[model samples]
Target: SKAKISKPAPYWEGTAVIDGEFKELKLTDYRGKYLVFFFYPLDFTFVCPTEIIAFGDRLEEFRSINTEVVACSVDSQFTHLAWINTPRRQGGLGPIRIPLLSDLTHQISKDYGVYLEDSGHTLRGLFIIDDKGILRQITLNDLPVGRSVDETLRLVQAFQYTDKHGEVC
Candidate 1:
């Protein structure tokens, strides 16, 4: 078991485009906060937009429950910006509210253990990190697999519940 007190998961920081502007984020910056971080395969693709927008739409809902949701991909910030600029009706994501972190170096994906070396892309990876900067839960999905806002909400709620109640079903 990879569980230990004070042993945080790997650290990653990168340039992310949020609301059409570039900014950097790091694990230390979000100390004492829950983080709902996810990784999509790429931008300008079939399944990516749906998942990105879904999370974007429900960002407030996640924030209400004390969680900060962020997304990442191996694409550059420019590609992420282009998709954000394009309209949804035109087969693109139009202004997804959450930050789309650019993982151009692929180091984050590799460190997170979701990188596909052969394809130079990442699998659909979802990670739930607690306030202490510890990885509490992780789900790795195939490229074709997407996520549901409702399901993700349930996961975060359950984690918080258990974290406080000392293991109750």
Candidate 2:
């Protein structure tokens, strides 16, 4: 089935590797808060670490705005953990502040339309879900072009303001 705009996003649940611990994460758990859910292809690779670390560095900004930042890939939670353990200077994503989840079954990736059928890897996809569970914004990028956290923060700010004041920017 196709996803409709302004409709509720697909439900997702999985064990996320956060700070070297495994925790169950459900989309419904974040019902009353904004969420920034992003998808990358895999771990232990280039370009992916850059964006993932950037998200980690700016996580506090999202936290300040009451938005939870999460990331997912098809790799298993164990793999994510190992990659986190490795240092970024050696090409590993070390110390990412956000939750790292594995879409091993690709169900969530398919729901989010970021799964690549031919390559069996997710693309760089970013989503902004509102506090009421409404799917607000979606952005997709191919490999090599990293996303900007600064602009994402502005977008979130605008989204918050518009939802409250009914104004456009």
Candidate 3:
């Protein structure tokens, strides 16, 4: 089954480019921290870079609330690395803070219900998984649209607040 809110998130494991090195990452590794897991359609694309860079640039905001940000695409780790190394001035992502997951096999995207079979890529899908490994929120945008970084931060803070106060207006 696909990921569902208030239920355990779908399992994901793969090679990720973390801090310029190849490392294995999985959903379970983020068990004790809130996770902002998002998917972009492809690397070296127009709209994808903005969203990725925005999340990377403001990573500290998420970490301050005990949250981690991760991004994924249907590209290989090598491709992800190349994009990271590419300069932003030339329309590429340069030195991103969050892990860039490589979903070449496409299983992870499939499980999350974001895979686009015809295009061999994903839509703009973001998932908010809580500290307990439960999925709390999901946002899926069409190919041409990008997501809001501030809104994402707000949602995470809202969830944390509700967890502490039991209710939020």
Candidate 4:
């Protein structure tokens, strides 16, 4: 039951750090809206923070198009909170705009086929699920490589445009 393009995304429900609070979030909660769901290796890491912050800073662009962005890691909720609380100047993610999900059991990662058993964490994996909950795109990067927020935004727009205006090119 792994995630696949044009198929229903793998269901996930877990505690997440949202707006500086602990709250439970589910994949279905983002139904009827596009979701840029992504997984990073861990909290308080080097490459991961840059990507997470990039998404957070540009979140409004995603929201304007009825898309929601969520990032997940194998860390606990407490760890997620700690990272969020730390100042960006001090090498921490400060005041993130999107939910930071905790996948302590690694179940969500496994279901998404992003779990790395050897490293006990996920590689950089990003999935773009459409408004109806069908996955439309996927991109996987190695641990050291970070993803692009602008590229993600463009891809989402491409999907939405195609959905409304028919095939592109």
Q: How do the residues 70-105 of candidate 4 rate in per-residue lDDT, one tens digit apiece? A: 999999999999998999888678888999999999
- For TM-score, candidate 1 versus 2, the one ahead is 2
Candidate 4 at 57: error in angstroms? 0.5
lDDT for each of the candidates?
0.84, 0.87, 0.93, 0.93
**Span of 10 residues, lowest total lDDT, candidate 3:** 44-53
* Residue pairs in collision within model 4: none
Off by over 4 Å in 4: 46-48
Please list the residue runs of candidate 3 whose C-alpha ends up more than 4 Å from where it truly belongs after superposition. 46-48
Residue-by-residue lDDT tens digits, candidate 1, 95-136: 877888999998888888889999999999888888889888
Q: By the TM-score metric, which is better: model 2 or model 4?
A: 4
The positional error of residue 45 in candidate 3, measured at the CA in angstroms, is 2.1
Give lDDT tens digits, candidate 3, residues 103-141.
Answer: 999999999999998999999999999999999999999
Q: Where is model 1 more than 4 Å wrong at Cα? A: 1-7
Q: For every model shown, what is its TM-score relative to the native structure?
A: 0.92, 0.94, 0.96, 0.96
Q: Locate the minimum summed-lDDT window of 10 residues in model 1.
A: 1-10
